[PDB]
Amino acid sequence: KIEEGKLVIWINGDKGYNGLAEVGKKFEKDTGIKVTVEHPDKLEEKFPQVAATGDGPDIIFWAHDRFGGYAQSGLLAEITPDKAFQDKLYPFTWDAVRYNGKLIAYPIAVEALSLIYNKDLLPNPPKTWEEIPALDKELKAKGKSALMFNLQEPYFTWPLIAADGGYAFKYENGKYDIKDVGVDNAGAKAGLTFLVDLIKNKHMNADTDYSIAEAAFNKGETAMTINGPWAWSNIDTSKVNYGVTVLPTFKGQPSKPFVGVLSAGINAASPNKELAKEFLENYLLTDEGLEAVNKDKPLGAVALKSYEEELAKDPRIAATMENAQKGEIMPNIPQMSAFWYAVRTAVINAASGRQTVDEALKDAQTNSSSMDVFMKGLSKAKEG
Amino acid sequence: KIEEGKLVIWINGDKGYNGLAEVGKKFEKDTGIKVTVEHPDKLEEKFPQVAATGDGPDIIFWAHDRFGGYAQSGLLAEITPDKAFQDKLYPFTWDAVRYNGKLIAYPIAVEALSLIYNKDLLPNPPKTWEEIPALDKELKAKGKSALMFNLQEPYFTWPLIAADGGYAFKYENGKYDIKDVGVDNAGAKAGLTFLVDLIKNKHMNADTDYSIAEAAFNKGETAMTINGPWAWSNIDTSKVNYGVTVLPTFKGQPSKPFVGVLSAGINAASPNKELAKEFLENYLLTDEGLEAVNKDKPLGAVALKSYEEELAKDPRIAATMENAQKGEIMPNIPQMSAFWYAVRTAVINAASGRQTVDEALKDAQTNSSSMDVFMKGLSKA
Numbered sequence: 001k002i003e004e005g006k007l008v009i010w011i012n013g014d015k016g017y018n019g020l021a022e023v024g025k026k027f028e029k030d031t032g033i034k035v036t037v038e039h040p041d042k043l044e045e046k047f048p049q050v051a052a053t054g055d056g057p058d059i060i061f062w063a064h065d066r067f068g069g070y071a072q073s074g075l076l077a078e079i080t081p082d083k084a085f086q087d088k089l090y091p092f093t094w095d096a097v098r099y100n101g102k103l104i105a106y107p108i109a110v111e112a113l114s115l116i117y118n119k120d121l122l123p124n125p126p127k128t129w130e131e132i133p134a135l136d137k138e139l140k141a142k143g144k145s146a147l148m149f150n151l152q153e154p155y156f157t158w159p160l161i162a163a164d165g166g167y168a169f170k171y172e173n174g175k176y177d178i179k180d181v182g183v184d185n186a187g188a189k190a191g192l193t194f195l196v197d198l199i200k201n202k203h204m205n206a207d208t209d210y211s212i213a214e215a216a217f218n219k220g221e222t223a224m225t226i227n228g229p230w231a232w233s234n235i236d237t238s239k240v241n242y243g244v245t246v247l248p249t250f251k252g253q254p255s256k257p258f259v260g261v262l263s264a265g266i267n268a269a270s271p272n273k274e275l276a277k278e279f280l281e282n283y284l285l286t287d288e289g290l291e292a293v294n295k296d297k298p299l300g301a302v303a304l305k306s307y308e309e310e311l312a313k314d315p316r317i318a319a320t321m322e323n324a325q326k327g328e329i330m331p332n333i334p335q336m337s338a339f340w341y342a343v344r345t346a347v348i349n350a351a352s353g354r355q356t357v358d359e360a361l362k363d364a365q366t367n368s369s370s371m372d373v374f375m376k377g378l379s380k381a382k383e384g
Numbered sequence: 385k386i387e388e389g390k391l392v393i394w395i396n397g398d399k400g401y402n403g404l405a406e407v408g409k410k411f412e413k414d415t416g417i418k419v420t421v422e423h424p425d426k427l428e429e430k431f432p433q434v435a436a437t438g439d440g441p442d443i444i445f446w447a448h449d450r451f452g453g454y455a456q457s458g459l460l461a462e463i464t465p466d467k468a469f470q471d472k473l474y475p476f477t478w479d480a481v482r483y484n485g486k487l488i489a490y491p492i493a494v495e496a497l498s499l500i501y502n503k504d505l506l507p508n509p510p511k512t513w514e515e516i517p518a519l520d521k522e523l524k525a526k527g528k529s530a531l532m533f534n535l536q537e538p539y540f541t542w543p544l545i546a547a548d549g550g551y552a553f554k555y556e557n558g559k560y561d562i563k564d565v566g567v568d569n570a571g572a573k574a575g576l577t578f579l580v581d582l583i584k585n586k587h588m589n590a591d592t593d594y595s596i597a598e599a600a601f602n603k604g605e606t607a608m609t610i611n612g613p614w615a616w617s618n619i620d621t622s623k624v625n626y627g628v629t630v631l632p633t634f635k636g637q638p639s640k641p642f643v644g645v646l647s648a649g650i651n652a653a654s655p656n657k658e659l660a661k662e663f664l665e666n667y668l669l670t671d672e673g674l675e676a677v678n679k680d681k682p683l684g685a686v687a688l689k690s691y692e693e694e695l696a697k698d699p700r701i702a703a704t705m706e707n708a709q710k711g712e713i714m715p716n717i718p719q720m721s722a723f724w725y726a727v728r729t730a731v732i733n734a735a736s737g738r739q740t741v742d743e744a745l746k747d748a749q750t751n752s753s754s755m756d757v758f759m760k761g762l763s764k765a
């Protein structure tokens with residue numbers, strides 16, 4: 001039930017959908033093709049539901065990590081950029097959208113979490129996670145707090161969990177060993193334990209989510225938050241005097257944020273595979289195109305080589321690059337979808353105390369690599 | 385023509401039929417029902433014949449792909465396991481034995497081909513199909529070869545044929561579309577052409593079969609073979625130092641072996657349906673039963689959740705699982721049998737040079753397709 005002759009695009013609500021719509025406007029002014037941008041909830045869970053029935057958007061935007069599962073279920077069209085166009089993007093970014101030997105999406109920008117901080121509340125950001133409790137105690141006396149960030153998504157907690165030796169899937173001999181999962185080793189337990197103690201000692205609250213943390217930071221209630229380039233625009237609007245810097249170290253080790261590549265995939269069932277290709281290659285992935293989106297919500301280190309000068313005027317991107325170098329590229333393998341759900345459940349359970357750290361992380365490793373998982377993987381590859 | 389009171393079971397001669405026999409011995413010791421295990425040649429062909437006339441075994445073991453056709457001909461009783469028992473097996477495996485809504489057999493184990501290599505001849509197995517010719521050239525100078533596997537059954541060549549885009553029947557929405565066959569596409573042609581060139585340049589021989597490839601690998605004459613878990617037992621006996629690994633890629637994409645679920649179906653003409661059911665749920669499909677069979681010839685990744693223990697340790701099973709993920713589950717539609725004959729013919733013909741690859745797959749495409757549809761199409765005068 002995908003209408004032919006018009007483009008429909010899904011992109012997350014935290015990203016610059018309005019700017020992207022503006023790119024859709026010029027496309028229409030040129031082609032007469034109506035471009036419709038939407039930002040549904042749980043769109044990364046929606047898409048495979050609807051695409052497995054031949055429905056959905058023409059173009060889906062998401063970080064590269066989930067496109068492997070999609071491709072595995074044949075939900076994504078293979079993209080066909082000529083050598084000329086490939087030479088316009090950094091090879092690393094193409095690599096991120098390569099699954100089972102095929103390009104499964106157009107890469108847009110490299111994303112990584114950074115430490116964002118209020119300079120008026122905190123002229124010098126803390127170098128270590130360890131000093132944060134004491135820092136919060138001081139700010140509490142001023143009716144402020146040290147740190148608020150989204151605790152409902154493992155994406156935001158991962159930098160701390162991976163710091164002392166946490167890892168998702170081991171990478172050996174040019175492949176991800178889908179049975180060597182590092183979410184239950186000593187490093188992970190240490191990172192998550194520090195997070196839980198922060199909550200035990202009332203320096204953070206288990207129920208803090210994206211909206212709550214963002215409001216608190218943008219209204220000057222808390223000295224720090226943890227977020228990506230997309231978040232900067234709302235801070236610009238808040239007039240809070242903020243800096244963007246390297247994440248704090250844990251046990252002397254750098255925080256390790258997952259590196260994501262925002263990517264645009266083409267629905268396998270789309271009747272407009274050719275229109276999608278011209279929009280993405282000729283309209284979006286251009287200086288003017290990316291700028292329009294970046295002006296709405298900053299993209300990060302974009303895939304387009306030619307944007308480098310423009311990005312060089314932005315110290316925030318420097319901080320993004322520094323945190324990216326210290327992090328690990330997200331795998332795009334199909335078992336990623338179950339990894340996330342597993343870690344999500346663990347972080348939330350440890351945080352709320354429903355489970356201990358040892359317990360939560362055991363179940364996390366069990367639910368991300370096991371015979372049960374592989375088996376469901378075999379049926380998921382057949383349906384989704 | 386099927387005697388009541390005792391159980392006759394059919395299972396392929398490459399599986400653990402002696403192991404199975406033992407399970408029947410612990411059955412005969414608890415009920416008094418004499419259990420007979422037989423492993424007839426062309427068994428997948430003989431069951432539908434004999435069982436149509438009310439003869440044949442009480443229980444047939446075969447990969448799930450055949451069972452769709454058996455069911456449609458009313459050769460299989462519907463099995464009635466309760467929620468309690470169904471919970472003991474992985475839901476993926478129950479799916480494989482589901483036809484037109486009804487469960488038509490008990491799933492036993494998940495099968496997939498892997499690359500098997502001799503570590504002494506070949507410390508690091510090749511990552512791509514493409515480097516095999518050069519490898520074979522090196523090995524030939526030592527009086528050895530790179531690769532031998534069974535070229536008489538399309539099952540063994542399919543992983544290569546599927547790699548770049550070949551497929552049996554298209555699965556879209558929730559069903560297999562019988563009018564969307566993929567044995568004739570560019571990907572199929574590319575893979576079969578590669579296989580044929582291996583043969584043309586003498587890296588392999590068109591007439592190599594299961595026995596020949598097995599003896600060659602198990603005697604240390606060839607560095608690699610392609611085979612399933614059932615084969616490991618003989619390699620163990622051979623004392624060859626071997627590993628089991630992910631199939632090589634072709635054109636940068638993984639080989640896509642078919643995934644099979646070894647299943648046990650109950651003859652619809654059997655007077656012993658209740659004994660057969662008990663034998664399967666209470667004897668075979670337990671830890672102690674699956675071990676007996678497994679110890680004879682490994683089964684692969686067994687359907688029984690509780691066995692997960694042993695399987696986790698075995699990296700051969702891991703390789704198997706790895707290959708299974710990259711592969712495609714065999715359809716079970718009645719048309720599969722015709723599909724198999726057609727592709728068997730095409731591979732054998734392309735391999736021998738009786739037909740070109742293009743010609744061979746064109747015909748395989750046509751003949752894999754449904755005669756009913758062909759005949760209806762002629763109704764368009």
Ligand SMILES: OC[C@H]1O[C@H](O[C@H]2[C@H](O)[C@@H](O)[C@@H](O)O[C@@H]2CO)[C@H](O)[C@@H](O)[C@@H]1O
Pocket residue numbers: 012014044063064065066111153154155156228260340
């Ligand atoms: O929390 C699990 C979640 O993490 C990542 O999602 C990020 C996304 O990459 C960012 O672009 C941004 O929108 O924040 C998201 C977290 O809320 C993974 O990409 C995603 O698949 C995963 O579920």
Ligand SMILES: OC[C@H]1O[C@H](O[C@H]2[C@H](O)[C@@H](O)[C@@H](O)O[C@@H]2CO)[C@H](O)[C@@H](O)[C@@H]1O
Pocket residue numbers: 396398428447448449450495537538539540644724
């Ligand atoms: O070659 C066609 C053949 O492929 C499959 O047979 C496999 C079977 O699944 C394995 O368990 C093992 O016995 O090797 C066989 C190949 O010789 C299909 O299951 C079968 O129906 C088909 O004839």
